[PDB]
Amino acid sequence: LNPSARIMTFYPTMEEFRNFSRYIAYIESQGAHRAGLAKVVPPKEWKPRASYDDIDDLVIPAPIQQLVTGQSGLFTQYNIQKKAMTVREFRKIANSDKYCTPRYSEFEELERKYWKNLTFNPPIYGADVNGTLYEKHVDEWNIGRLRTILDLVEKESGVNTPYLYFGMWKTSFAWHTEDMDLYSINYLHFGEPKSWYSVPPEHGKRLERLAKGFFPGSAQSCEAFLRHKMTLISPLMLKKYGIPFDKVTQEAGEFMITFPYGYHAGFNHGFNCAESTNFATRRWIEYGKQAVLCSCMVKISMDVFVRKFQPERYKLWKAGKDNTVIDHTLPTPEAAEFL
Ligand SMILES: O=c1[nH]cnc2c(-n3cc(CCN4CCC(Cc5ccc(Cl)cc5)CC4)cn3)nccc12
Ligand SMILES: [Zn+2]
Ligand SMILES: [Zn+2]
Numbered sequence: 001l002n003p004s005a006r007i008m009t010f011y012p013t014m015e016e017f018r019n020f021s022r023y024i025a026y027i028e029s030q031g032a033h034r035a036g037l038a039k040v041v042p043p044k045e046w047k048p049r050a051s052y053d054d055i056d057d058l059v060i061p062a063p064i065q066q067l068v069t070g071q072s073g074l075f076t077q078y079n080i081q082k083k084a085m086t087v088r089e090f091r092k093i094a095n096s097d098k099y100c101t102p103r104y105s106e107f108e109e110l111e112r113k114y115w116k117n118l119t120f121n122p123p124i125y126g127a128d129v130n131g132t133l134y135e136k137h138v139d140e141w142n143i144g145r146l147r148t149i150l151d152l153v154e155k156e157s158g159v160n161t162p163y164l165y166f167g168m169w170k171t172s173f174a175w176h177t178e179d180m181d182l183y184s185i186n187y188l189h190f191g192e193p194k195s196w197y198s199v200p201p202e203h204g205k206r207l208e209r210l211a212k213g214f215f216p217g218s219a220q221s222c223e224a225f226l227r228h229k230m231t232l233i234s235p236l237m238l239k240k241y242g243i244p245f246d247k248v249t250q251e252a253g254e255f256m257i258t259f260p261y262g263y264h265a266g267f268n269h270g271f272n273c274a275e276s277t278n279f280a281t282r283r284w285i286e287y288g289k290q291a292v293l294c295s296c297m298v299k300i301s302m303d304v305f306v307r308k309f310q311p312e313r314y315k316l317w318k319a320g321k322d323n324t325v326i327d328h329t330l331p332t333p334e335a336a337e338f339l
Contacts, residue, residue, distance in 0.1 A: 002031025005200035007246045009039040017043055020141050021148060021334065024183075024257070024281060028331040029338035035246055036262020037198035040255040042141065048134040052190045052273070055133070056088040060126035060166055063090070068119045073237030074214055075118065077174050077230050082124060087166060090126050094168035094271035099123055101169040101192060101270040107249060111195065114267050115234050118170055125268075126166030133164065133189050133275055141255065143185055143275050149305075150182070150280040156304045162277050167194070167268035174229045175199075175207065175265040179298035181287040182278040184258040186250070191272025194250040197235060199263040201328040203244050207233075207263055210241050227294040232265065260287035261328065283332035285309055286324060289317065 002008065010027055017023065023040070032038040064079040093099055098121065104110040132144040143162045154160055159179060169192070178184050188194050199207045211219070211231055218225040225231075238245050250256050252272070258264055260283070280288075285305045293299060306314050316322050331339070 002034040005034040005202065005244065005246075007035045007037050007039065007198060007248045008032045009041065011041050012043065014043045014045060017046065018140055020146060021281070025332055025334035026338055027257070028281070028283070029335035031329075031331075032257075033259040033262075033331065034200055034202070034329055035198060036201050036204075036259050037196060037246070037248065037264055038257045038259070039248060039250065040257060042253070042255065046140060048138045048142075048187070049189070050135070052133070056086060056091075058087045058131070060085050060087065060090060060129050062128065063124050063126045065122050065124050066171055067122045068232065070119065070232070073115070073234030073240075075232035076215075077172070077232055080122075085126070087126075090124070090166050090168075091271055093124060099168050107195070110269060111235075114170060114172075115236070118172065118232070118267075121170075123168045123170045125168070125171035127163075127171075129164040129166065130158065130161065131164050132162040133273065141185070141187075143187060143277050146185070146277065146279050148279040149282065149284075149309075150278060152304055152308070153300055157301065159278050159298055159300070162275050165274040165276065167191075167270075167272050167274070169270045170267060172232065172267035173265050174231050175211070175233055175263050176226055176229045177204070177261050177263055178258055178278055179227070180278075180293075180300045181260045181291045182280055182284060183260060184276055184278055186256045186258075186274050186276040188250050188252050188254055189273040189275060190252050192268065192270030193252075194256075194266060194268055194272060194274060196248050196250060196256060196264055196266040197245055198248070199238075199243060199245050201259065201261040201263075204261050204263055204328075207238075207243055210243060222294060222296040224292045224294045226263075227297070260284050281332040281334055282309060283330070286326055289322065290324075290326060
């Protein structure tokens with residue numbers, strides 16, 4: 001389903017929520033994947049940590065200062081690595097007069113203030129922090145241990161590990177797909193909202209074509225230059241060039257799911273914390289095999305997946321004759337139980 005490819009929101013009951021791989025198959029069966037991004041609001045009784053007041057001494061080893069260059073909706077983000085700091089040190093900076101969220105009536109106002117000021121007063125993003133804020137006993141939707149078919153990488157051979165994102169106002173993530181065109185889970189533990197922009201995978205190539213036209217020097221240097229996660233394109237720029245996209249705001253205690261080859265970027269409203277990781281379903285294997293990778297980085301040997309799930313195609317794929325065409329609208333084989 002999902003004909004217009006719009007971002008869908010789900011409210012699973014505690015029973016539906018219990019199985020992660022089953023629910024993903026469920027949301028795929030409802031066409032959630034067509035948007036490239038879906039929101040999952042978990043049961044009201046469900047909590048992964050009783051309190052976030054015990055993490056002030058937690059170390060952010062490589063905070064990055066985000067320097068943005070550009071104009072006319074077109075930007076490049078340069079990351080400057082800064083010395084290690086604590087969550088206590090970070091929160092103090094985030095909430096300071098120099099870095100705090102401006103006063104705003106509505107989101108459209110905050111969005112406009114972001115697109116107008118992202119080049120000034122560079123913020124610090126306490127991104128890519130190895131760790132989890134989930135309590136060990138928490139079995140439902142545990143980012144640390146999702147136990148998807150992706151775990152085969154580690155089982156046989158940090159993509160499968162959790163990462164925390166301590167954000168402040170204006171810190172942002174550039175347009176990108178997941179490494180190896182994998183899926184992603186992103187839980188916002190606490191704090192101020194996280195706004196998201198998404199392009200449906202079926203229009204993924206249009207955005208690429210548009211970026212290739214805007215940064216031809218970057219495109220001549222690298223086939224998959226968007227993977228560098230440095231390109232920022234404003235919603236107005238996308239609308240001007242007729243690129244279909246959708247937007248959504250993630251609030252604390254909500255989950256966002258990025259689907260294979262579903263381009264996304266966004267920004268933080270203020271001081272917050274988000275944990276994320278990559279995962280996979282049987283549908284991903286074909287995206288993993290066909291993924292255009294950074295030539296100038298995260299690379300996964302597909303051989304193990306093709307052995308187990310496509311042994312009949314192993315010889316044809318190892319010969320370079322696997323001419324399989326991907327249908328971005330087809331749900332995962334695991335969704336059969338719902339069709
Ligand atoms: O809100 C967001 N903020 C920031 N980023 C976001 C985001 N993505 C962030 C990543 C990077 C993930 N990860 C990559 C690898 C890196 C360590 C590394 C490197 C090489 C090798 Cl070979 C082994 C390990 C650590 C980091 C991918 N998507 N998606 C959605 C939302 C957000
Ligand atoms: Zn991502
Ligand atoms: Zn590259």
